[PDB]
């Protein structure tokens, strides 16, 4: 398309942003049906917006079964989320847009106070260094829809972070104009990669100004992909020797209980036959290393975190069941930045929420690097839709962000769970 200077209102009068914002919203709103307009317009309401952003996160980590239950039930939040997505589809950018994406500290895996606790005004250099260490060159996905605030009135003073980025031409968008804020609305699932962070002061208040690239991770959430495995692992079996195939098939079908436990026991007492199988399974998994960086999922219970298996992030309060904020906060503060050791092979799926694991509260969202020793289990008898990626033994999960959610289990059941963002790391013999 024809080249145009980007949308940029940062160094322009407010009235200019307001005029542009009003026409554009009107223009979008005219493209919308009545139900899409109410769903979209209500996002100017902060309680509604929070709720909808929350729900739009929750449904990515609910089983495909729960989604259907909700469709049947005519779930108004799921419907509103679906109407918002559809509304966004009717509008595509003509040019780049420059502005501020609405990431909070928590969404950049920051749990400590950025600003001084008392005045909520100053950021120390030590704090700056600590945030740089957490965020620089790290990729953080916004699960919900994303706002791009178009001028300095969009800066929320209570938020100690300003994330400035560029949205490329051809992306879907809507524009919302309310009460001195002009913003774009954008799709779920974009990431920011922070590239620099300095301290800026506007109106006596300190912010961490972050310049980031907008990107996107290869992530299938609860849908998984039937194409990714065929594309990348369609000829996998044919690349294995007989002994690699046999050893792997054995692990998948019969040996994994024994092998996992032998490995979890630091190989004591020594078992030469198990040693031989393990050697051959590891050997198989490096025949076709992970070909590109992607997200795979492993739901687990409390055990790897030294917690009861039946540990709940929920509590009885006034009759109903609500989130235990205290438990969430303490779990996040203890585990952000920690490494989870996996002595045995680790099972993983392209699907975030296989329904048999609906009640597993700790949802590892694993960045597997290109080159990672593992394989998508394609064409094996019995694995007919698990969409499994088996990772090599000694795969460490280094946690960079922990995001509480309200997973939907069935018509009558919800559950506070945690999305645990980690990188798969292999300090790796074999």
Shortest Å, Cβ 297 to Co ion: 31
Size of the site for Co ion (CB under 5 A): 4
Q: Which is nearer to Co ion, 207 or 236 (CB)?
A: 207
Which structure tokens are listed for 408?
């939907």
Residue 113 in contact with Co ion, rule: CB under 5 A: yes
User: What is the phi/psi pair of residue 174, to 5°?
Assistant: -130, 165
Q: Does 160 bind Co ion (CB under 5 A)?
A: yes
What number of CA atoms fall less than 13 Å from residue 111's CA on the CB side?
Answer: 15
Least distance (Å) from Co ion to the CB of residue 207? Answer: 10
Give the single-character DSSP code of 275: H
* 224 is an interface residue for Co ion by CB under 5 A: no
Q: How far is the CB of 201 from Co ion (least distance, A)?
A: 15
By CB under 5 A, which span of 158-166, 327-335, 341-349, 378-386 interacts with Co ion?
Answer: 158-166
Distance of closest approach, residue 117 Cβ to Co ion, in angstroms: 8
Closest among 162, 138, 126, 127 to 337, alpha carbons compared? 138
The verdict on 208 binding Co ion (CB under 5 A) reads: no
For every residue of 329-375, DSSP letters joined together read HHHHHHHTT-EE--SS-EEEESSS--GGGTT--EEEEEEEPTT-SEE
Q: How far is CA 227 from the centre of its chain?
A: 21
Sign of CA dihedral 350, 351, 352, 354: negative
Check residue 114 for interaction with Co ion (CB under 5 A): yes
Segment interacting with Co ion (CB under 5 A) among 28-36, 106-114, 135-143, 186-194: 106-114
**Residues 21, 97, 109, 115: which binds Co ion (CB under 5 A)?**
115
* Ramachandran region, residue 91 (left: φ > 0; alpha: ψ -120 to 50; beta: rest): beta
3 state SS of 99: strand
Q: Which is nearer to Co ion, 115 or 361 (CB)?
A: 115
The site map against Co ion for 64-103 (x = CB under 5 A) is ----------------------------------------
Length of the chain: 430
**Interface stretch with Co ion, choices 70-78, 159-167, 171-179, 271-279 (CB under 5 A):** 159-167
CA–CA separation, 214 vs 166, rounded Å? 7
Binding site for Co ion (CB under 5 A): 113-115, 160
């Amino acid at each position: 398309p024809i080249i145009k200077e980007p949308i940029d209102f940062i160094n322009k009068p407010e009235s200019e942003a307001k005029k542009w914002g009003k026409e554009e919203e009107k223009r979008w709103f005219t493209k919308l049906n009545n139900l899409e307009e109410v769903a979209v317009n209500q996002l100017k309401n902060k309680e509604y917006k929070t709720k909808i952003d929350n729900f739009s996160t929750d449904i990515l980590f609910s089983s495909l079964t729960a989604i259907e239950i909700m469709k049947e039930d005519e779930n108004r939040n799921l419907f509103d989320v679906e109407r918002i997505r559809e509304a966004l589809l009717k509008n595509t950018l003509d040019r780049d847009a420059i502005g501020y994406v609405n990431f909070t500290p928590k969404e950049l895996g920051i749990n400590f106070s950025i600003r001084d606790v008392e005045l909520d005004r100053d950021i120390s250099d030590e704090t700056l260094d600590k945030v740089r260490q957490q965020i620089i060159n790290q990729e953080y996905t916004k699960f919900s829809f994303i706002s791009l605030g178009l001028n300095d009135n969009s800066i929320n003073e209570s938020v100690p972070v300003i994330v400035k980025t560029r949205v490329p031409t051809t992306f879907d968008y809507g524009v919302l104009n309310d009460k001195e804020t002009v913003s774009l609305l954008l799709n779920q699932g974009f990431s920011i990669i922070p590239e620099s962070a300095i301290i800026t002061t506007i109106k006596g208040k300190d912010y961490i100004l972050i310049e980031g690239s907008l990107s996107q991770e290869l992530d299938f959430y609860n849908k998984g992909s039937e194409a990714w495995g065929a594309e990348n692992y369609g000829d996998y079996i044919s690349k294995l020797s007989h002994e690699q195939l046999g050893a792997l098939e054995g692990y998948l079908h019969s040996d994994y209980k024994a092998i996992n436990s032998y490995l979890r026991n630091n190989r004591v007492p020594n078992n030469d036959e198990l040693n031989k199988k393990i050697e051959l399974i590891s050997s198989a998994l490096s025949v076709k290393p992970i070909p590109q960086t992607l997200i795979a999922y492993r739901r687990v219970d409390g055990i790897p975190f030294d917690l009861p298996s039946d540990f709940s992030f929920d509590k009885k309060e006034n009759g109903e069941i609500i989130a235990d904020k205290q438990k969430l906060n303490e779990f996040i503060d203890k585990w952000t930045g920690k490494e989870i050791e996996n002595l045995s092979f680790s099972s993983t799926s392209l699907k975030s929420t296989p329904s048999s694991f609906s009640k597993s509260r700790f949802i590892f969202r694993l960045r597997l690097s290109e080159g990672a020793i593992g394989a998508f289990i394609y064409g094996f008898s019995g694995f007919q839709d698990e969409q499994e990626i088996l990772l090599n033994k000694n795969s460490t999960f280094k946690i960079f962000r922990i995001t509480p959610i309200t997973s939907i289990i069935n018509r009558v059941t919800k559950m506070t769970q945690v999305v645990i963002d980690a990188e798969g790391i292999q300090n790796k013999e074999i």
